[PDB]
Amino acid sequence: VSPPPPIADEPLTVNTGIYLIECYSLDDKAETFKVNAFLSLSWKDRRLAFDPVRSGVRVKTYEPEAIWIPEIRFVNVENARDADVVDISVSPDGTVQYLERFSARVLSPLDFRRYPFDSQTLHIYLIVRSVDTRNIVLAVDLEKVGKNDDVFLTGWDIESFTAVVKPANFALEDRLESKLDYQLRISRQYFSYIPNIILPMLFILFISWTAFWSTSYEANVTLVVSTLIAHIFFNILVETNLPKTPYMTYTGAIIFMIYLFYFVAVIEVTVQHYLKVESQPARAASITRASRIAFPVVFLLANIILAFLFF
Amino acid sequence: VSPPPPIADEPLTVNTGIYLIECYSLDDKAETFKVNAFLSLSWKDRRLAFDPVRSGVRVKTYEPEAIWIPEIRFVNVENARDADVVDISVSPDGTVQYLERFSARVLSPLDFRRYPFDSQTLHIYLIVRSVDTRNIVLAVDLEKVGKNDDVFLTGWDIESFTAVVKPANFALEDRLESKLDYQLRISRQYFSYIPNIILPMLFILFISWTAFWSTSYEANVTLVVSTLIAHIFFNILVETNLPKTPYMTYTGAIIFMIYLFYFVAVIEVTVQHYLKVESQPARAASITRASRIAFPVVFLLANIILAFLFF
Amino acid sequence: VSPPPPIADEPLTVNTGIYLIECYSLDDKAETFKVNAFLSLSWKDRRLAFDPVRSGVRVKTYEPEAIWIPEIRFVNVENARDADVVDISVSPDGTVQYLERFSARVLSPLDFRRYPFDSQTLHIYLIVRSVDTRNIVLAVDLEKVGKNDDVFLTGWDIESFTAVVKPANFALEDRLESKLDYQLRISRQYFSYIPNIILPMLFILFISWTAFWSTSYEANVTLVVSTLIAHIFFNILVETNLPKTPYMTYTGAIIFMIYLFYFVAVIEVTVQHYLKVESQPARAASITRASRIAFPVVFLLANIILAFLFF
Amino acid sequence: VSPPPPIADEPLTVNTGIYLIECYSLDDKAETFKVNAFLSLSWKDRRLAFDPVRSGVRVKTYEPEAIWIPEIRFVNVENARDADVVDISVSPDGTVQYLERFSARVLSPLDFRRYPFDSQTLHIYLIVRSVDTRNIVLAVDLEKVGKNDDVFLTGWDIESFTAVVKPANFALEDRLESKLDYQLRISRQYFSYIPNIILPMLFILFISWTAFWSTSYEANVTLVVSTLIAHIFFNILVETNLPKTPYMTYTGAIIFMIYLFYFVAVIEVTVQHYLKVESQPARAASITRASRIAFPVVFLLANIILAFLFF
Amino acid sequence: VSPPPPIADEPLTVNTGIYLIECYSLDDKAETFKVNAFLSLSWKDRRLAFDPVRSGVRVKTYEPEAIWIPEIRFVNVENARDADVVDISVSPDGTVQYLERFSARVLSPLDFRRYPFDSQTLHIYLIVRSVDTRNIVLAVDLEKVGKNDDVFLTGWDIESFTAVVKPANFALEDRLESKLDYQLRISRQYFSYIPNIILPMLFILFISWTAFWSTSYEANVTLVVSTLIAHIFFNILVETNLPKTPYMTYTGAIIFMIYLFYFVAVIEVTVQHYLKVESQPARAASITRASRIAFPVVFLLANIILAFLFF
Ligand SMILES: [Cl-]
Ligand SMILES: [Cl-]
Ligand SMILES: [Cl-]
Ligand SMILES: [Cl-]
Ligand SMILES: [Cl-]
Ligand code: NA
Ligand code: NA
Ligand code: NA
Ligand code: NA
Ligand code: NA
Ligand code: NA
Ligand SMILES: [Rb+]
């Protein structure tokens, strides 16, 4: 089999569509997601044209091997898609309608800057390489782009699935290449982060501040050091759910900042004890009373500054 | 091969059945389960009809390639099922009886609201896409729906395996699609959660309340902070067995609430010490004595409220 | 290709044998094990009869596709076995000798009641479904059932590999099925559980009992709470190696009981401090002295009772 | 099919090119990386030559089975590459232009000496074995070596992708083998290690040094022992992201050294308490005051020495 | 195709060789390793002999399907090897030279008795089953046994790769079987265990011994209990990198013994406090002073005894 010949000099237009059936396994660390979808293809092949009056048949069904089919690939996949051809239909004018159901693991970078209050645009890049006989170009049939109502991505809200209609046509290894960008817009369900990570982390921090209403050095050391260790556990827990980024994430910033608060609280607890031992408790009392206001106030202002810089 | 032609304009009815052989790997985090079953198919193909007398047989056995077979798929699968055809039998009137043994990983959302005292309805959606030649509709042969007595799903009780007899017929990319819903009802074996998570979590909380029979600030700080950290360990342990949900689970609610009890116990321990230092122990004694009753009472009432809201 | 025809009316007997080459990956949580074995099959197919004089050869060698082969399956497998035909030898009367080497992941439930001092009976169920032309039945050739001397299952002792000679013949979806039960008896190597989990857990418990020779409340709180937390770590460690069971395991029972001992030790430590503060140390001394005997005695008796209930 | 015959006695030159499409999964522990790329091949096959005039075609397309294709393999792969032939074009003189898209898991050793401030040279070794008919040699077509601009390796910066033009020709199993070295130069994005591991580890160490401004043995024991345990947690965390090396890594060196600082701080805390109890606090005071300067100074100098030895 | 016929009554000798290209994934817990190698086979097939002067060709290259090839398998593999035939060469006398490149996951038991100072002998067992026509026996061509210089097994030193030249010929299921033992000798790179596990474990133990220079019960309880818990963390860490063994490993023995030292240190700390409270500090002082010498001395002697028993 060979490509359909051009009537003039025009490139062959392959109309495409992706209909999402299943979305699963959005892996943050790997920056991948798995997809199960319909891929639809359409192009004119005049060699396949027939008479509907004499044939009595409106459509002809072909097996993939019987006809020429464009070699469509995904750019951002781990391995080549697992595909099963569903149908091939030819209209009397020779317009071919191809439909396959496929499954693939897609590589798509994620921006963790606003984590866990982040939104993402996942991409599925469709591609075709031109043949020596003729140039192949891709197009979007919007009537064949969509998603099943039941499509759910655990821990995410699916906003939209659209295609950028204009392909990116470019040369690669001395041939033309035609690339389409299918975009799946998602927003993270931040809910669970509140009772599981955020609030527990704030509770232990506030517990360390009870040391500002205590003169007992021994108890103070226990309060600040114990809660700091619990903070380390939360830091480790958070970093296991995320890849290593060349930038600060919102959660990372807060987690990092909280260490500074524990560090300064240890200095205060130390200074307080030192003055008490040096028979200067009135001074120690002034520092401790100031700390009761300073710590929550600086914590609130630093958080307002951070939220402002990140959102 | 082509579909059986319609005598009038009728859709082709494909009778289905699923007989479960094995159920395994119900993954809560992934919201998947693995299945090994028999899939049975039946439809009328007049072109296959024969005379028993002339042929000298009452049944005819074909190879899948020799005859037309409907392209039946599962909607909610990760990848296409691994299937092996067992038998194809034709009756004199062209009634085809198809049997395959398959294995598949099924995506089925889970409701964790009542975890670990939850029940689920797992779905296996069977689907067929109509052809240009004819419309294909699915039906349930109840005599061919069932499960082996030995079918066990580790950590779950299997209640029933039934099919919703009326298919959900709908248009998808200008073709009729016929969808059947096979339902596997299961209930979680909550037993082990009691000695492993629930009771240990209650024991550490009750241990934190012994601080209401102690005047020692240093010992109190140790009792409350240590038990809080152990509570954080249980919270982390629980959240590892579950996906992130945009709602509160029953266990999640209790775990979250217990933090508030630890937070208020730290306030009480702090207030008690502060008053003792300020030479007002009679007051501190009133707060501590009230706490001995208030803490267990509020804990019991809050749990009754939560159980009521969740069950 | 169709089944061999009956001389009279008898069912076709397929003689079977399983020879184990490798046993690996007994996964307690999944209740699976991997197997690499020889599957031997033997049946008479008179349509394959030949004259050694004419054909030259005394035994014919065939390719699986060239002849009829019974569709033998495993019941309790995750996916269909990976098999490679080693030989298909046909003798002059038409007796076929089939040999394949296969690998499979077998689902076989485990009884954890006596863990880690438990024994198991793993099953490999061989099955054949009857056809319309004729009924197929399975038999065991004991001369072809066995295991390699080097077969080792990490963490287990292999006792025996035998087959229940009588097949279970039954109706399934309006056709006969013939099922054979191959049994692999194993016993767990409990050795490592003693220095790794059992003894460390007993040491920390005995360490908490040193609080019965101390009047220091602060030190007592540290002894009992610290060792309790280490006990929680061991409980978590143990539960990670096991699935969730709707029953108590032997280890689970001991682990659970030890929590009660920690809970009562905290009560004793609290009661002792309370009386000391109330200027009644003589009483506190009576309770502490009784505790020195009561705790180890009740621990020993409770363990005798548990061992009796479980073994 | 057989190799192209030599016009004289020359070896057959197979021109190669690798164009990287995707780079993912650089696993430090496994010392592997996954690659998705174009592999281009070019060689002259006289037997396939044609006259453009009598053919009416300027180029001829073939199926891989129709013509002789060199058996090109990768040396450093886990399993053989998953490849899909994209195009095979033949020019009039019989110059073949082969293009495949492949995916492979590459084994490439990593030098962790400067971790996490390390750079690596990943290798992809292309190989061909000679035949009895003729010697097959590999060459690099520099015009066909490259990478997509969007190629991103999570946690790394990609510097260059070049090929060593001269192949390594040698005998292997009595046939000559022609090996090409494709080099991917990368540098680790160390950013995240600073707020996640480095700074938290320094904060806890500095917190242990507050014991040099405290006379309280009980509080000192708590400060030093608690922070040491948190240091053990960071040591464990770091070692989980790395394979076991027969050398010291930069991070490993610092982590190890910090243990010595904790060990000496415990000695100081012990010596201080001992002298205090022995009624010699003036002495203890001299040791403690010296420690306040000595600990940070020796820490800074040891770090300058280490950075010097490693960079 | 059928086997080559015997000239007299001799078994067919299949000469073998394994040349290691890659060694990776030595999994201690699973007792497996992955291998990528060349497998060479050689045997005489007279039915394939040809005239060198008449034919003009010195060697004939065949496709695997065109000729008879012995069915060679590996005994100790998880699944059948992934193999790709590289070349088949026939010399005039009919000597066949077969070469394939394969990848396999090999099951090979490991002796952990001396861990982490252990050495292992990994096995790759090659096997052939005889046919009815004739007996097939295996031999080693030492000229075709070896390994690439770049072969590295992360965390191990590769010593030698040799074959036991004499096959183990035995009857299995009424046919002869010929088995060859290929041995890969390796020694563990123990280096990293020293700064990561051994030294940190010794540091915490020595820190517990500072309690012998302290009269503070409260501080002593904190020193011994805290360090014991850190020892439990190291015990857990070590046991995660190892399978469960029916014997004691060297590291396991030391780890277990260290618990006894912590247990006796708690007794000493308890006895010391008890005597102090009973107004007998002179005695307590004798026990504490003896402990300062006894603990390190008994620790050193017990380690010399253990090293002697294990090495
Ligand atoms: Cl693709
Ligand atoms: Cl499917
Ligand atoms: Cl099977
Ligand atoms: Cl390859
Ligand atoms: Cl093999
Ligand atoms: Na085609
Ligand atoms: Na068909
Ligand atoms: Na067959
Ligand atoms: Na070829
Ligand atoms: Na062959
Ligand atoms: Na303390
Ligand atoms: Rb104290």
Swiss-Prot record, chains A, B, C, D, E:
SUPFAM superfamilies: Neurotransmitter-gated ion-channel transmembrane pore, Nicotinic receptor ligand binding domain-like. Residues 1-189, 241-248 are periplasmic. One of its GO terms (molecular function) is extracellular ligand-gated monoatomic ion channel activity. The chain crosses the membrane at residues 190-212, 216-240, 249-277, 281-311. CDD domains: LGIC_TM_bact (cd19050). Consists of an N-terminal ligand-binding domain that encloses a wide aqueous vestibule and a transmembrane domain that forms a narrow channel. Homopentamer. This is Proton-gated ion channel. It comes from Gloeobacter violaceus (strain ATCC 29082 / PCC 7421). The gene is glvI.
